[PDB]
Amino acid sequence: ATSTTIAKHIGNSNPLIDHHLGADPVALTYNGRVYIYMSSDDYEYNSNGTIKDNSFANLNRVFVISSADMVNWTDHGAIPVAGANGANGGRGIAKWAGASWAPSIAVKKINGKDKFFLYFANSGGGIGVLTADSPIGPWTDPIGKPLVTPSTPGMSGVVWLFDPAVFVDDDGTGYLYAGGGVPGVSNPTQGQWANPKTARVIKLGPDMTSVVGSASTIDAPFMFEDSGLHKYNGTYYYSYCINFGGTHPADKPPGEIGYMTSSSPMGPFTYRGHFLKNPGAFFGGGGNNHHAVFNFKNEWYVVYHAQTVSSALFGAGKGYRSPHINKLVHNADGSIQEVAANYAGVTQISNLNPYNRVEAETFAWNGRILTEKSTAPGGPVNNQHVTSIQNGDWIAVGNADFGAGGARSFKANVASTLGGKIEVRLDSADGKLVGTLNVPSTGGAQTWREIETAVSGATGVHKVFFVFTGTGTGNLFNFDYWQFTQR
Numbered sequence: 001a002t003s004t005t006i007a008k009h010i011g012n013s014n015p016l017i018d019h020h021l022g023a024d025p026v027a028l029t030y031n032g033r034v035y036i037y038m039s040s041d042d043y044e045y046n047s048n049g050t051i052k053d054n055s056f057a058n059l060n061r062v063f064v065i066s067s068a069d070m071v072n073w074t075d076h077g078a079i080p081v082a083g084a085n086g087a088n089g090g091r092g093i094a095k096w097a098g099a100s101w102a103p104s105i106a107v108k109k110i111n112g113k114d115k116f117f118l119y120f121a122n123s124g125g126g127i128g129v130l131t132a133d134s135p136i137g138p139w140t141d142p143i144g145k146p147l148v149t150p151s152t153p154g155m156s157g158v159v160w161l162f163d164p165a166v167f168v169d170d171d172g173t174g175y176l177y178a179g180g181g182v183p184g185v186s187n188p189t190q191g192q193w194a195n196p197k198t199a200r201v202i203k204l205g206p207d208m209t210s211v212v213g214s215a216s217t218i219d220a221p222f223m224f225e226d227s228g229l230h231k232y233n234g235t236y237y238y239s240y241c242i243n244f245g246g247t248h249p250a251d252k253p254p255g256e257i258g259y260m261t262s263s264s265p266m267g268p269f270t271y272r273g274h275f276l277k278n279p280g281a282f283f284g285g286g287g288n289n290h291h292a293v294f295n296f297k298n299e300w301y302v303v304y305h306a307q308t309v310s311s312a313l314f315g316a317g318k319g320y321r322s323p324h325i326n327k328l329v330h331n332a333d334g335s336i337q338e339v340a341a342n343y344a345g346v347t348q349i350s351n352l353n354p355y356n357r358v359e360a361e362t363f364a365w366n367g368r369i370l371t372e373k374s375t376a377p378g379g380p381v382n383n384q385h386v387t388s389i390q391n392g393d394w395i396a397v398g399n400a401d402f403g404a405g406g407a408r409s410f411k412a413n414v415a416s417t418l419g420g421k422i423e424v425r426l427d428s429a430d431g432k433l434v435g436t437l438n439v440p441s442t443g444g445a446q447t448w449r450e451i452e453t454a455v456s457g458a459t460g461v462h463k464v465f466f467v468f469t470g471t472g473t474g475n476l477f478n479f480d481y482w483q484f485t486q487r
């Protein structure tokens, strides 16, 4: 049914979202929210409409979601990064780039103001950067040529010049890690598998949109891709995905996330071991492994991908990937424990306040809707709405705190051709009905009205379900934001 959750099931926190896909995740922690930026995985089909394996043909945008609590995620839509080959309908930002794989994100205070930098790979040929004054844009290409190419000093022996990771150190110096691939083309020797020497680190200029000096090689044993950097107790941890070829020793298992430490961001690094098995080990099958380690609201986590949504829909992952987050633990000696990747994920860290404007596209669970960029007046940058709403569809938030006094009323911004209803229920999709909002015909799908209705019996902490009903097909209404009022 639908009606039913695809993969992220009520009470579980992984995958983070399941109303569309998101590969190669990276995290930015910024002023009480974590933002996750992702390659734009999107199904490819044979001409007869049957699913086929991901060939990365759709990897020309960056999807962005954010959360204050690890359970409810705001969908910020897509950044149209790639602008070459007519990509993104002429509205792509980096006109030189045909692709925008594997984003990295950084924030640095420049001239007294926080500036944001989004890095990406134009497939395996070069890394670019876009800039913005907020974590969600709007975005500018201040170069627009690649930032790093094989002609950048120190980058010549890189096989795949991709998968950037950008770190801003405590002294404000930025560093870019990148590269991967295995030399030897169709058939690497054992020694080429064991020491590809294709990983690189280069210092960035103060502006974060230039490099200084030359790149240094990081000799990551069995390097493949997926550079990562985090800093824990004054030590720099370079992490990466271990390759799949050649014989491997016990301590460098194929397709797992390995890590190295150094007292300096540019090395020398020493291999320490491995902390994330292949997603296939946990969720069945196998595929590429991509990750980022981050500290959010004082806890260490890893964001990574797995084929958990595509598998649920098609009965095979086919290379189509979804974001997951689990806790990461450093030991007293500075080594990292194996991450227990799972569906349960991270328990909600803070309650949601239902008395502020909350985007309709801020939800923890759904069955089964879509989000798209919204014609509603006002709203946040790249404001989205919930759409593809049919009778019996629903969305839900985790742990909204109505307080002891509870809610007086409920408001929703909606656009509808024929009208419908939003039932507000506590705890479950068939739970206590605290109100029902009648969505009128507004004049059309792009004509917006804020509607208010009474609620009663909404006190304390509950999951909240918004259950959609109406007659006729197809889309009952679009749904932009909501807000409760306090008793």
Ligand SMILES: OCC1O[C@@H](O)[C@H](O)[C@@H](O)[C@@H]1O[C@@H]1O[C@H](CO)[C@@H](O[C@@H]2O[C@H](CO)[C@H](O[C@@H]3O[C@H](CO)[C@@H](O)[C@H](O)[C@H]3O)[C@H](O)[C@H]2O)[C@H](O)[C@H]1O
Pocket (backbone or CB within 6 Å): 056, 123, 124, 125, 159, 160, 161, 162, 225, 244, 255, 280, 285, 286, 287, 288, 289
């Ligand atoms: O090989 C065994 C194996 O074990 C199985 O149980 C698992 O299911 C598999 O995951 C695993 O196979 C490996 O799977 C990973 C995940 O996709 C592959 O890595 C990708 O390699 C290809 C290259 O063929 C990709 O696409 C290439 O990217 C370059 C970047 O420059 C680009 O030029 C071009 O479009 C492609 O050639 C990705 O880059 C990798 O993630 C292993 O190849 C595969 O053996």
Ligand SMILES: [Ca+2]
Pocket (backbone or CB within 6 Å): 359, 360, 361, 374, 379, 383, 384, 385, 479, 480, 481
């Ligand atoms: Ca909205």
Ligand code: NA
Pocket (backbone or CB within 6 Å): 024, 025, 026, 102, 103, 104, 163, 164, 165, 226, 227, 290, 291, 292
């Ligand atoms: Na990455």
Ligand code: NA
Pocket (backbone or CB within 6 Å): 367, 368, 369, 370, 387, 388, 389, 390, 393
């Ligand atoms: Na639907």
